[PDB]
């Protein structure tokens, strides 16, 4: 496939219950819900209006406070979607509307039904050549095994996630051979493990703020190599690194409110390449 090509994107509206009731590891500043909604609107507007992806917007469900974070409930690779069994019990029913959306996009559907398996899509790094799957408090070995069985055309290897929510809490693909990676002790240890497991030499884009290593790369006809990344207002020292990339069309995207609930850029979309 052309790495990073997409035609469609699934997103989901924020429930009011997110502000107080979404899961979060840090009990920090309160969420400004209206501002979170605006940030989500702008994010969707980049993907759909600016970049031209066909947007499927799922409605909010107030009983699912984290339902905006569609990434965790599906992994899509080519024509196949894995509907995950998220680690958090409060998120499991998010799979219901996602399964229906992906069915309607004509994907082959595989459901993680094994009650001994969990997997969050945020733990999954697809490089274009292979998968790395974080083993975290959300994703277990059996989950990773089911992913490997689902996507047999690609190698799958695992990496411990120790002191973050997900693997992609501190990394993401920034381009076809380019892993964006944080500078923490933990981020760097994870990167070394991924690299030691692969026979492929990846380039890295190292940033000083781990959560600013979570970005979205797209290959869009008529625009080229596009990268959605955190803003200078939010992470000035990491934005300076992204700004050196004259080889990408850079789009700064604000995400401060959802980061209060550990939601990073990748978490709010599921990308699909159809036809």
Curated annotation (Swiss-Prot):
Optimum pH is 7.8. It catalyses: N(omega),N(omega)-dimethyl-L-arginine + H2O = dimethylamine + L-citrulline; N(omega)-methyl-L-arginine + H2O = L-citrulline + methylamine. This is N(G),N(G)-dimethylarginine dimethylaminohydrolase 1. Disulfide bonds: none annotated. It comes from the Eukaryota. Hydrolyzes N(G),N(G)-dimethyl-L-arginine (ADMA) and N(G)-monomethyl-L-arginine (MMA) which act as inhibitors of NOS. Has therefore a role in the regulation of nitric oxide generation. It comes from Bos taurus. Substrate binds at residues 23, 66, 71-72, 91, 138, 261. Belongs to the DDAH family. The modification S-nitrosocysteine is found at residues 215, 267. Monomer. Keywords: Acetylation, Hydrolase, Metal-binding, S-nitrosylation, Zinc. InterPro entries: DDAH-like. Gene3D superfamilies: L-arginine/glycine Amidinotransferase, Chain A (3.75.10.10). Its EC number is 3.5.3.18. It is an enzyme of class 3 (hydrolase). Widely distributed, highest concentrations found in brain, brain cortex and kidney (at protein level). GO terms for molecular function: amino acid binding; dimethylargininase activity; zinc ion binding. The keyword Zinc applies. Zn(2+) binds at residue 267. The active site is at residues 166, 267. Copurifies with a tightly bound zinc ion. Activated by release of zinc. His and other agents that promote the release of bound zinc ions activate the enzyme (in vitro). Inhibited by S-nitrosylation. Zinc protects the protein against S-nitrosylation. One of its GO terms (biological process) is nitric oxide biosynthetic process.
């Amino acid at each position: 496939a052309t790495f990073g090509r997409a035609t469609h994107v699934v997103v989901r509206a924020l429930p009011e219950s997110l502000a107080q009731q979404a899961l979060r590891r840090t009990k920090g500043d309160e969420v400004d819900f209206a501002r979170a909604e605006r940030q989500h609107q702008l994010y969707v507007g980049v993907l759909g209006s600016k970049l031209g992806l066909q947007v499927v917007q799922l409605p909010a469900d107030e009983s699912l406070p984290d339902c905006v974070f569609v990434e965790d409930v599906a992994v899509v690779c080519e024509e196949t979607a894995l509907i995950t069994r998220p680690g958090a019990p409060s998120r499991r029913k998010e799979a219901d509307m996602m399964k229906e959306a992906l069915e309607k996009l004509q994907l082959n559907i595989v459901e993680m039904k094994d009650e001994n398996a969990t997997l969050d899509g945020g733990d999954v790094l697809f490089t274009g050549r292979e998968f790395f799957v974080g083993l975290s408090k959300r994703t277990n070995q059996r989950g990773a095994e089911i992913l490997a069985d689902t996507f047999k055309d690609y190698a799958v290897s695992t990496v411990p996630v120790v002191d973050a929510l997900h693997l992609k809490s501190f990394c993401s693909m920034a381009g076809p051979n380019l892993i964006a990676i944080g500078s923490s002790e933990s981020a760097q240890k994870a990167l070394k493990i991924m690299q030691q497991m692969s026979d492929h030499r990846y380039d890295k884009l190292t940033v000083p703020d781990d959560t600013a290593a979570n970005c979205i790369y797209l290959n869009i006809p008529s625009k080229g190599h596009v990268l959605l990344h955190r803003t200078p207002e939010e992470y000035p020292e990491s934005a300076k690194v992204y700004e050196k990339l004259k080889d990408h069309m850079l789009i700064p995207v604000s995400n401060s409110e959802l980061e209060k609930v550990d939601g990073l850029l990748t978490m709010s979309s599921v990308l699909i390449n159809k036809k």
